[PDB]
Amino acid sequence: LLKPEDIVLKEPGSSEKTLRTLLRPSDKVSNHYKTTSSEISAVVGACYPTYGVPTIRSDIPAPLIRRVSDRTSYGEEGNAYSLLHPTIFAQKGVFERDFFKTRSKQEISEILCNIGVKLSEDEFENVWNLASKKHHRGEVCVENIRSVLDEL
């Protein structure tokens, strides 16, 4: 015949029990008398897009033939260490966009038997599958094909 809830007697913990005090009608001031010092400040340590330009401008595509007036960065000029001790690709003029470009099945097939690697047809299909699985978007790239052939 009683309620299942009987409260503690104070803001001190583990007090002796007491009944729940009744708040009479038109005398509930909890919804109206909230505080304003720390109540507006609730930053819990337990989301939004980003505005401005990046300092590298990798989000915009790079132009093919540059104007003379272009001083906006694109990232293709690498570090000075990569200009003072270049890879042989950089030494004679093939670079990372030619690595990362989307080539063809016949282009990779012509690459295989002419770069000095003899590959089975099933091995080539598996290499293409592993390269497309390694690439997030999924295509054929020189870096992806060489990395999959080196790892597997």
Binding site: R24, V29, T36
Partner: protein, 370 residues
């Protein structure tokens, strides 16, 4: 941590202090039999300022009724009181509560300055408390006779209390006829309005506001020289049954009606007045560029009429807890040159006391001058 001893002395003070205790009890959520209602946790945090409690949820005020008393206990909230201090001895009860208190700051005495009980016994008992606690503030709310007895009374009181509030029933009546369209002024309505004006300035003592200023700070801010201390109250967002839906509510709107001449508690003339110190105590959830911008904009509209040779002629205070019902409210209080007219009329109406009143009138004159 501020404390308060409340004494109802004389008849009019008795019936206004009764409404005082009713107003603070409804704002703090106590059933008149004494039980606490705890809808929000902010109600009981500083009940120590005006109360001491009893065993079993009962609470009882720090108030002494000395001079009617059967009528008060027969009234709405009589059952809260202590029946052992209904004195009609006063020294023993005032040291009893002030010795059970921890750290004292101020006293709320309700009296008048026009009769044989509120004036002489008021001055006697303020002497009898200032001889006992010389480091407190006596907020002694008072009623003076209309300019259309006090000279005997005031000339120890102006030495002692410095926190009296003296304009009266003619202004109360004209407020009721004009800005409220209130057809029948009952005595209880004026007791209600004075009591809410009491309770407006007692929220920096009881609640955590935003710009927290207690009574000693109010004394230091308002009173320039130790004999210019009679102040002017007023309560802003008052209107009728009709005009609510026609008016709006903002800080620029309540600024209008806290500096409205027809709203203030005065049968006086701000057009012949010059405010030395103003305090506008706000209650509610309000942005504060509105407060400070409207403060100095309404000071900007009147360069002559606020006092010259003072840069900041105003002061604002604000608390985070509004009144009951109203989303925000304001209470304006002033210290002007618009008050010596009452002194002139009450002096044109012993002899060294009359000379001291002429001294106070000349004090206003020589400080209003350049």
């Amino acid at each position: 941590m501020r404390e308060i001893v409340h004494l109802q002395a004389g008849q009019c003070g008795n019936q206004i202090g009764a409404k005082f205790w009713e107003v603070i009890s409804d704002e703090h959520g106590i059933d008149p039999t004494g039980t606490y209602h705890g809808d929000s946790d902010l109600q009981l945090e500083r009940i120590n300022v005006y109360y001491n409690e009893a065993t079993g949820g009962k609470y009882v005020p720090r108030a002494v009724l000395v001079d009617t008393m059967d009528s008060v206990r027969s009234g709405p909230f009589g059952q809260i009181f202590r029946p052992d201090n209904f004195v009609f001895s006063v020294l023993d009860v005032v040291r009893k509560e002030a010795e059970s208190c921890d750290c004292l700051q101020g006293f709320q005495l309700t009296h008048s300055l026009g009769g044989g009980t509120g004036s002489g016994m008021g001055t006697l008992l303020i002497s009898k408390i200032r001889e006992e606690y010389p480091d407190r503030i006596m907020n002694t709310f008072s009623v003076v006779p209309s300019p259309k007895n006090a000279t005997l009374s005031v000339h120890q009181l102006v030495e002692n209390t410095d926190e009296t509030y003296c304009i009266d029933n003619e202004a109360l009546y004209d407020i009721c006829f004009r800005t409220l369209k209130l057809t029948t002024p009952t005595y209880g309505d004026l007791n209600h309005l004075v009591s809410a004006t009491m309770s407006g300035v007692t929220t920096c003592l009881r609640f955590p506001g935003q710009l927290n200023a207690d009574l000693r700070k109010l004394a230091v801010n308002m009173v320039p020289f130790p004999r210019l201390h009679f102040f002017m109250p007023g309560f802003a967002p008052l209107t009728s049954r009709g005009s609510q839906q026609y008016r709006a509510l903002t800080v620029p709107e309540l600024t209008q009606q806290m500096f409205d001449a027809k709203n203030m508690m005065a049968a006086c003339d701000p057009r012949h007045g010059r405010y030395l110190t103003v305090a506008a105590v706000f209650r509610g959830r309000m942005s504060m560029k509105e407060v400070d911008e409207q403060m100095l904009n309404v000071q900007n509209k009147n360069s002559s009429y606020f006092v010259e040779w003072i840069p900041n002629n105003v002061k604002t205070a604000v608390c985070d807890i509004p009144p009951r019902g109203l989303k925000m409210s304001a209470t304006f209080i002033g210290n002007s040159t618009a008050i010596q007219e009452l002194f002139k009329r009450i002096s044109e109406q012993f002899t060294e006391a009359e000379s001291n009143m002429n001294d106070l009138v000349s004090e206003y004159q020589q400080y209003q001058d350049a």
